[PDB]
Amino acid sequence: PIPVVDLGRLDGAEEATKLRVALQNWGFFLLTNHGIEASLMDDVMNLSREFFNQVLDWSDRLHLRVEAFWPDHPESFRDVLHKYASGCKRIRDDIIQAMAKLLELDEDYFLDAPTFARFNYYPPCPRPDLVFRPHSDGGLLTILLVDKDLQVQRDGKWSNVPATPHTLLINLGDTMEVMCNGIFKSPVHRVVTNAEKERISLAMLYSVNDEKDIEPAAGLLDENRPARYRKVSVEEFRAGIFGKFSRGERYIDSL
Amino acid sequence: PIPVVDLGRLDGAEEATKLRVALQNWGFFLLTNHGIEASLMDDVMNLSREFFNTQDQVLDWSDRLHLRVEDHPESFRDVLHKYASGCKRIRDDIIQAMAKLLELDEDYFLDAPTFARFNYYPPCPRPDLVRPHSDGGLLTILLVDLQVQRDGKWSNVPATPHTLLINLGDTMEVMCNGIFKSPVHRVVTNAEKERISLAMLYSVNDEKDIEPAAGLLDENRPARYRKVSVEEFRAGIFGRGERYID
Amino acid sequence: PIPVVDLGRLDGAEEATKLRVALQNWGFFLLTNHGIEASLMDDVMNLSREFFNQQVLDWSDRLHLRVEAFWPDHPESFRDVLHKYASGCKRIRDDIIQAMAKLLELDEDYFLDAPTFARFNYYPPCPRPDLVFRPHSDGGLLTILLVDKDLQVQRDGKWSNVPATPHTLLINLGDTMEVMCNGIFKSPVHRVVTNAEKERISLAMLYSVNDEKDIEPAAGLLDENRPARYRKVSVEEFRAGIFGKFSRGERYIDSL
Amino acid sequence: PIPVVDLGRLDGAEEATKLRVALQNWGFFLLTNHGIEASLMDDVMNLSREFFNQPIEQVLDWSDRLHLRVEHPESFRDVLHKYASGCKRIRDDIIQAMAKLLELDEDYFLDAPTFARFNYYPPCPRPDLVRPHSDGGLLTILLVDLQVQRDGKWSNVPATPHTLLINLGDTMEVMCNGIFKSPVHRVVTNAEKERISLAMLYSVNDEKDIEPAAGLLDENRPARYRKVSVEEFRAGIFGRGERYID
């Protein structure tokens, strides 16, 4: 039973509650019928596997920041990349726009910040070994692409998310859960792949600026809807996500 | 305050207790005077950042390739493989040197692929710097042209030229029963400062059950750690958020 | 900083939000100007130290007992004085639950039950080099408390002391009430630490709840943008839960 | 699966090792053939439950507690002192007996008054039952007319008369290097069944600073626990709610 949203028919009524039911329960959904055209998606997927072409190979990672004329049909990798990103930005602003109205805050509430792109290419390569470490995107949102077929933690159990072609996974980042007042949830995920199978993924990451500090949202607290999160500065927030105190499954074992 | 060890003078008596003092307090040390020579290490580092030399308005902050292995050449599958099997030796000289501090026969271990992690970190600006964990799987040897989590502070590890720092993985800690313990680490770097890195990670194949080592648990040297199958140990190692503090 | 509510003047704009600011920050307040008469409070306290009096020295003794025709209109001697206070405390309680249900815009009648019981702890004087009883969070449904010595809460990891002042009643919310509320109001965590060589009599009314309509966050308080912070568990798996878990214990902190 | 130990045979290797088998795996045992005699135990149980002569002649009953420090009889200040000082003896025979399984001289001491908890849970009405924690002292010896958390399950401890149940406290565990463990326990009753209990608790005074035991930690048997002062140890012990399952 997996949440799907249609980018059209949002501003809808039902597809707009579908967003809500999706963001509260799972913190993620997969968005179909957006604006990006399948012609562009496959080329980003494929120009990517191309850009990366005993001793065998397990993965390739590049992550890099975005932020003449330009072809209505791009074809250079440095150019096809740009149409999709600025295709994703529009998809994004449609999203936070719908949210701000699910939460009954002005739509304009949400505002700019830098953008990042992470490419993970997981080639085939025959073998019987699995390796990678779950994490939760500590940012605003993340818009994710996959061709060559991904899992989230809910109720301690892990469950798989079927990535289906020409559709886009979109999940919420931690700081955005703070800001939503926990009304919407930032999920936990991990990637597990089998060695000898292809898995190209390209994920857009939207962080946020040195601005008015990560605290829960303005007109969303009153006398009877208290704040679930403390007010921390954009910077104590950043150091936080890279500072760990005590944990580890190895100590889970200690006795 | 950083232990430096010598691969020579090892066994010895002085460099042989440096390990204990290093591996018990903070899980790792920096090895000088290995078998590996600067021509080779420089050539792996320079043949490495090369695997990817041209894109602008998309600026770059990353670069990883992950690959399995198993005098001086200059094809890649070879500058690597001369380095790869040079590290294999350094691995086994401590695993020998270390079963030896444990008051057991040296050969107890000797048990399954090896992995290689490549990184390189170059951009153009200053940071929009936006993760800590512990290398959880039996010994890893690290090269660069990192910080450790002791007691609550994150004390950082100065890496010195052409030396190979080596830290223990969780699988090791469980087995020798915590006498030496696997540290926790993080990487924080500046945008506009390069750091090419090369790590060799040694895990183990589906053999043995991961349990602390038979010959060091007396009647009153009990086991502090349980036995898990190299199956659920795996599922443990891949299965809190700073948001939760609030 | 110390919250106090005036029981009269409650059901009035300001003293009614004084309750809210109190229940949100720390699980408790100090209620003054209740209906109970100072004559009766002192006799409970004193008829109580009495009931327990009737190298080897004494450090504490506790009594536990459940609540529920001619009866003394006014004075008594013990076991009748107890009843006037208890059924003086039930009224104080129902006045309080009533205001809470209106602070959160839910019908007042919602809270309606179903038993009640009382814990008596008497802490005599002694010699002095030792401290034993501790921490716990009142698991249940609000508690009404009496004291005449001088009690600690664990808000913000640090521990602060609560000044217990005479002819005043300390009152805190129970665990099942934070669940029942939507976490809007909080059930505090507390401890008692006393010095050997000091008197400390305390009597706490505890109001629990019956096996009835299941512990869930409160009905008309969830809408489309007020999700529920707590799961619905049976009145029974709730009871077993509070007496059975794993945790770390300060001895494990030391494990290193 | 309850280890039962004998005060007699508390050497001879046979009852001397069930003790060890009890204290490592579970943390407690039940002693038969002590020095304490049923004429006495019975009198402490009857002089105590009686400490409540006749109060009431609309308020039903839940329980009675007595908490007080200790150091021919048949006065209450005397059946206790004969009982109290019979327990001191059982304490030191065990403190001796487990100082030798630890391979050191017996003389731990560094001992630290004595405290006595009396709990009587008389009957009343049945309906409902709306403590889990660990005795964080040193040792506690229990008499009755509860449950232990072995792993995830809560398994019951059958107390049979007139034997004396005896468990380890946290500071004992810290002092060994955890070789013997401090268990966790709970009490569950139906209301309407008598349960008189008498427990003697052994703490230690503001002295020699709680750290694991000198002559048990060597080059390949490190200390698993840090040193805390009898002061900071105290504040820890009286300083996650099931509601948080949430």
| Residue-by-residue DSSP string for B85-115 | HHHHHHHHHHHHHHHTTTTS-GGG-----EE
CATH class, B4-238 region: mainly beta
Q: Are D133 and C245 in contact (CB under 8 A)?
A: no
Nearest to C106 by CA among C194, C184, C12: C184
Two structure tokens written together for C4: 């106090």
- In angstroms, how far is CA A5 from the centroid of its own chain? 15
Distances (CA, A) of A83 to A39, A62, A87, A208, D167: 11, 19, 6, 22, 71
Distances (CA, A) of C164 to B96, C25, C40, C45, C95: 67, 18, 17, 14, 21
Contact of A240 with chain B, judged by CB distance below 8 Å, is answered with yes
Distances (CA, A) of C101 to B189, C105, C219, C249, D12: 54, 6, 12, 37, 69
Rounded to the nearest angstrom, the minimum Cα separation between B101 and chain D is 8
Contact of D244 with chain C, judged by CB distance below 8 Å, is answered with no
What number of CA atoms fall less than 13 Å from residue A48's CA on the CB side?
Answer: 31
Q: What is the CA radius of gyration of chain C?
A: 19
Q: What is the CA radius of gyration of chain B?
A: 19
Please give the Cα distance from D216 to D223 (Å, whole number).
9
Contacts of D45 (CB under 8 A, 6+ apart): D143, D145, D196, D198
Two structure tokens written together for C20: 């809210």
Report the first-to-last Cα separation within chain B, whole angstroms. Answer: 35
Residues of B in contact with D101 (CB under 8 A): 220
Two structure tokens written together for A77: 């990798």
What residue of C is the nearest CA neighbor of A180?
C225
Contact of C195 with chain D, judged by CB distance below 8 Å, is answered with no
Please give the Cα distance from A124 to C99 (Å, whole number).
66
Question: What 3-state DSSP class applies to C119?
Answer: strand
Q: Which chains does B contact via 3+ CB–CB distances below 8 A?
A: A, D
Distances (CA, A) of D218 to A244, B221, D100: 31, 11, 17
Q: What is the CATH number of domain D4-239?
A: 2.60.120.330
Q: What is the CATH number of domain A4-252?
A: 2.60.120.330
Contacts of D105 (CB under 8 A, 6+ apart): D99
User: Whats the size of chain B, residue-wise?
Assistant: 246
Contact of C211 with chain D, judged by CB distance below 8 Å, is answered with yes
Q: Can you state the angle between helices B76-99 and B15-25, rounded to 10 degrees?
A: 90
Contacts of D151 (CB under 8 A, 6+ apart): none
Would the CB atoms of A183 and C17 count as touching at under 8 Å?
Answer: no
What number of CA atoms fall less than 13 Å from residue A9's CA on the CB side?
Answer: 11
Report the first-to-last Cα separation within chain C, whole angstroms. Answer: 38
Find tokens 């003054």 and name the residue. C32
Would the CB atoms of C251 and D170 count as touching at under 8 Å?
Answer: yes
Would the CB atoms of C227 and A102 count as touching at under 8 Å?
Answer: no
Two structure tokens written together for D31: 């002693």
* Declared resolution, Å: 3.2
Contact of B213 with chain D, judged by CB distance below 8 Å, is answered with no
Contact of C105 with chain A, judged by CB distance below 8 Å, is answered with yes
Contact of B219 with chain D, judged by CB distance below 8 Å, is answered with yes
Residues of B in contact with D219 (CB under 8 A): 20
Would the CB atoms of B59 and A82 count as touching at under 8 Å?
Answer: no
Nearest to A177 by CA among A192, A168, A187, A191: A187
Helix, strand and coil percent figures for chain C, each rounded to 5: 30, 20, 50
What residue of B is the nearest CA neighbor of A136?
B241
Please give the Cα distance from D223 to D236 (Å, whole number).
20
Q: Which chains does A contact via 3+ CB–CB distances below 8 A?
A: B, C
Q: ∠C76-C82-C88 over CA atoms, to 5°?
A: 100
Domain C4-254 fold: Jelly Rolls (2.60.120)
Contacts of B231 (CB under 8 A, 6+ apart): B206
Rounded to the nearest angstrom, the minimum Cα separation between C255 and chain A is 10
Q: Which chains does D contact via 3+ CB–CB distances below 8 A?
A: B, C
Distances (CA, A) of B234 to A190, B131, B209, B229, B238: 14, 20, 11, 8, 7
Question: What 3-state DSSP class applies to A209?
Answer: coil
- In angstroms, how far is CA A32 from the centroid of its own chain? 15
Would the CB atoms of A226 and C24 count as touching at under 8 Å?
Answer: yes
